[PDB]
Design a binder for this molecule. Structure first.
Ligand SMILES: Nc1nc2c(ncn2[C@@H]2O[C@H](COP(=O)(O)OP(=O)(O)O)[C@@H](O)[C@H]2O)c(=O)[nH]1
Ligand SMILES: [N+]
Length: 173
């Protein structure tokens, strides 16, 4: 509200918020009070949520699906200026799949200039990977071509969310 109003203002931005299922995307939106959305289903089993806030638009969907739906993802790339990629830091077994999904998205032709915010989510859970190991595990340390940042978060209690969004808004072009 007053916080979102100060961070976003009347700024115009097109943002994707992606991550594997269970990473914490729905919780992040509920915590920011972005309770309403519009669902589109471009093919059975592929659900997209779109949230508008003033001159901001988010598109949100789970990655990690069937390979055959990957062509449909690029319908959402044109004009996208910010990618928010949400990672469950307690799920050590799927970090390599999250790495491969991320690099698949940012290597698309139409995604060459989006900056990358990582939410390193679920920092409160037993033996969650820390921001600095997430940097290495997601292969970010080797990305020299663009600006990126890893924000530790606990989406259930709201920690790190406003800090992450302040990075994104201050760095987007
Ligand atoms: N402990 C903990 N659980 C979280 C956190 N964020 C999300 N969750 C839980 O993880 C599950 C998946 O979250 P959800 O928002 O549905 O993920 P989505 O599938 O990406 O939308 C739910 O049970 C959330 O409450 C967090 O930071 N800490
Ligand atoms: N979700």
């Amino acid at each position: 509200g007053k916080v979102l109003s100060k961070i976003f203002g009347n700024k115009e931005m097109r943002i994707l918020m992606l991550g594997l299922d269970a990473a914490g995307k729905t919780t992040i939106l509920y915590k920011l009070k972005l309770g309403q959305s519009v669902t589109t289903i471009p093919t059975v089993g592929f659900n997209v949520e779109t949230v508008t806030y003033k001159n901001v638009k988010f598109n949100v969907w789970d990655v990690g699906g069937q390979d055959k739906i990957r062509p449909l993802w690029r319908h959402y790339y044109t004009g996208t200026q910010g990618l928010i990629f949400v990672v469950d830091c307690a799920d050590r077994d799927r970090i390599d799949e999250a790495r491969q999904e991320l690099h698949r998205i940012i290597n698309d032709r139409e995604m060459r200039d989006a900056i990358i915010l990582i939410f390193a989510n679920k920092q409160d859970l037993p033996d969650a990977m820390k921001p600095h190991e997430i940097q290495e595990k997601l292969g970010l340390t080797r990305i020299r071509d663009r600006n990126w940042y890893v924000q530790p978060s606990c989406a259930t209690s709201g920690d790190g969310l406003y800090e992450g969004l302040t990075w994104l808004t201050s760095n987007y072009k």
